Design a protein around this ligand. Structure first.
Ligand code: FUC
Ligand code: FUC
Lengths: 309, 309
């Protein structure tokens, strides 16, 4: 009784960041999810500040890789032997699904591989793409592969970084049928079982749906599905981690307030395991004031009935 | 008296992010600064949460640009007519030096320009470089130029984004003599005066130097100077903005604690206007435990004498 008061930050949606790719939030979206399994590994955190899945604290690290590269002779492809984010040796023994910040969806992520030669400080950067559905995508084992636009420029045994930019669609896939944001990679490679996963989430209360914090990933080629939905803004992960306020019930009731009118636009349930639901049936792009923000009002139970969104 | 207690977050250096480029912090550095003018515009915030210069809240937006592009015929160069970060019209009337997150140093920043065609969702991405020392670099006026590897692929009148990756050195400049991290761009173009700047900072107390929060920018070509020093971690900007705790004096005394020993490694002054000094003379790479963190201990005056670092 009387535990440290819980709260959410006073930040607008546009002031916040996707927790699944290093891009700002744009909008709120709700829709049915019974046709897929919603089990992202980034953007996972309890309200009392326990990080889950592959979630870490800074959004700039999400979908980045570091290590050194080995040329696949006769190609423009390179295997990256992963390092830790601080350039130390990779330690695969942590009880996590994959290094923190590893991509948590199947898709073709395009970005840039950069490298510095230690002896002289010479540098180089080239377009690179990682296919996280590849049989050889095995970040938990410390290896991933990049397709690049060079077969000779990258040196072995030198620090190399991948900075993500966006996603592509190619290879005869159907328009907007990739990336597949709700398909988890096999983190140890094809036909291995993922471990230490944050659980799947779903609305369980009749008439409820998940509320998604949505961005549009940049597209780099083809006709990709650029929608990217996270369960928590990165800033909420950061805030809960720092506050570590105890949950007094299973559900924190939040009101989304419009400062231009002083009135509540909608209310929602922030589940203590770290996801949000609203009372709505159907796909809906929420129309919000850009200065709107969420406000924690009370601890309720999972069987509280929300006002329709 | 009795004002809301000030604090800094319990985050390690490696858990934090540079406030001047979207990359993690790596280390702490101190050195003399009397030979340059230290006046960065990103990573500027008072301890009571007032954002300064071009500082905004999410690190992923730093050094990004959005808008639409106009091809310079007979070249592979494009002028970007800037939009707001949320894709609304750019409003140059705000009393800021340039759009929030604009680069605050002179250098050649390489990244990727991406574009989506609205009608069909077709996408494209190409290597692009902005030279923030260019006479035509005029983000405050809503204009910047990109050199790319195409003269035909980018459409006019479509949403286009620049995602930064790193820096280059070329054009016969001396090795490691660019970027110039302490040279501010002319935000309205060559021979215009910058406005609404966060002030220059310097140590004033004898025997003190600035403490810098340092990263290494990726290099994309040539022999760039990749050192990037910020005055405050991005997470401290975020935290002070959210806490808005009043400063009880000009200086917050912080101790850097080593949890592996329980002892203080060094102490430093966090000035209320948002920068840090230490008692040291000379260039020094601080050797810190990776789990070390800063802790606010007391309000002191600017005339307090620190223990030597
Ligand atoms: C769908 C197509 O994808 C890539 O080939 C782009 O280079 C084209 O401009 C177009 O967007
Ligand atoms: C200094 C040089 O810079 C660019 O030309 C790179 O492509 C080279 O590999 C080398 O790093």
């Amino acid at each position: 009784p009387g535990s440290k008061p819980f709260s959410v930050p006073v930040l607008t949606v546009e002031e916040m960041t996707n927790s699944r790719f290093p891009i700002p939030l744009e909008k709120l979206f709700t829709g049915p999810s019974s046709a897929f399994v919603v089990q992202p590994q980034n953007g996972r955190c309890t309200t009392d500040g326990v990080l889950l899945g592959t979630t870490q604290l800074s959004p700039v690290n999400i979908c980045t890789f570091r290590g050194d590269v080995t040329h696949i002779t006769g190609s423009r492809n390179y295997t990256m032997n992963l390092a830790s984010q601080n350039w130390n040796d990779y330690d695969p023994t942590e009880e996590i699904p994959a290094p923190l910040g590893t991509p948590d969806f199947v898709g073709k992520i395009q970005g840039v591989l950069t490298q510095t030669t230690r002896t002289d400080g010479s540098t180089r950067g080239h377009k690179a793409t990682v296919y996280t559905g590849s049989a050889d995508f095995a970040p938990k084992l410390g290896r991933v592969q990049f397709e690049t636009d060079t077969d000779r420029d990258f040196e072995a045994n030198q620090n190399t970084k991948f900075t993500p930019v966006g996603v592509i669609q190619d290879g005869g896939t159907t328009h907007r049928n990739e990336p597949q944001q709700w398909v988890l990679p096999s983190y140890s490679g094809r036909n291995t079982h993922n471990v230490h996963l944050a659980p799947a989430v779903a609305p369980t209360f009749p008439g409820e749906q998940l509320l998604f914090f949505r961005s549009t990933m940049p597209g780099c080629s083809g006709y990709p599905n650029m929608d990217l939905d996270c369960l928590l803004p990165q800033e909420w992960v950061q805030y809960f981690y720092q506050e570590a306020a105890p949950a007094q019930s299973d559900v924190a009731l939040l009101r989304f307030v419009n400062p231009d009118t002083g009135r509540v636009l909608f209310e929602c349930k922030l589940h203590k395991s770290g996801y949000v639901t609203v009372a709505h049936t159907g796909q809906h792009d929420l129309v919000i004031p850009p200065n709107g923000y969420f406000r924690f009002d009370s601890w309720v139970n999972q069987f509280y009935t929300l006002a329709p969104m």
